[PDB]
């Protein structure tokens, strides 16, 4: 029979002029909401959350890695580096670069941290090591953002994103001190006020990571949500659209997140 849970998501994507992918897990009950959950969508800047987690994992066994100053020059800067552009002569620690990448989507900080892992291949290998077979990243900023329809490079699925997010924020993929730092970085994100955060009651807590490729209507958000009186919810909302000049929509992301939270048992 027709999937009645799915119908309002299909209407939402049709109104948007593209495709929406959603996965949500109630970690209390095991309930889920799923819509195109296993389809691939471009990661865009949402990869930077997993980047910071991979650096935290490395930091467990490399004493003082997170505390290490990185002295970079202007050759490291690229567009949308509002934090990094301020520390050319003072540097930033690995922890500070991680916070910038997570909480401001700083592009230069992301590329500096990719270098610490052995590039996009190194981050992909970390994701394989936690059991994520879907995540693919093979470019640096800005090239990973092209988001061309049918290109599986630099993509993941809403379900894989959510599964990996739960392992890293609530499960055992990081040691507790590192898990906690990842949570605190996500909670302090500044870029997501119009996406999943706009979908929750104001008294719920949220940690999230956004991404915006912009072209091909492509943008996303994933989050861990601590609802009043409930176990955490983990969810991912990704969008794409067929034409290069199609515009992404924050409001559509928020609307999809609301339907997920409503449908979720
Ligand atoms: B990233 O894909 O997304 C960031 C914004 C976000 O977290 O939602 C900005 C940096 C990356 N994108 C780009 O460099 C292109 C941009 C899109 C809108 C602002 S910059």
Swiss-Prot record:
It catalyses: a beta-lactam + H2O = a substituted beta-amino acid. GO terms for molecular function: beta-lactamase activity. A beta-lactam binds at residues 45, 48, 80, 105, 107, 210, 212. It is an enzyme of class 3 (hydrolase). The active site is at residues 45, 143. Keywords: Antibiotic resistance, Hydrolase, Plasmid, Signal. Not inhibited by EDTA, inhibited by clavulanic acid and tazobactam. Inhibited by cyclic boronates, including vaborbactam and bicyclic analogs of taniborbactam. One of its GO terms (biological process) is beta-lactam antibiotic catabolic process. The keyword Signal applies. Its EC number is 3.5.2.6. Class A beta-lactamase which confers resistance to the beta-lactam antibiotics, including penicillins, cephalosporins and carbapenems. Acts via hydrolysis of the beta-lactam ring. Has penicillin-, cephalosporin- and carbapenem-hydrolyzing activities. Initially two different KPC beta-lactamases were identified from two different Klebsiella (KPC-1 and KPC-2); they were later shown to be identical. The class A beta-lactamase family has a specific amino-acid numbering system, sometimes called Ambler or ABL numbering and often misspelt as Amber. A multiple sequence alignment was used to derive a consensus sequence and then the consensus was numbered taking into account insertions and deletions. This allows use of identical numbers, e.g. for active site residues, despite differences in protein length. UniProt always uses natural numbering of residues, hence there appear to be differences in numbering between this entry and some papers. Belongs to the class-A beta-lactamase family. This is Carbapenem-hydrolyzing beta-lactamase KPC-2. It comes from Klebsiella pneumoniae. The lineage of its organism: Bacteria, Pseudomonadati, Pseudomonadota, Gammaproteobacteria, Enterobacterales.
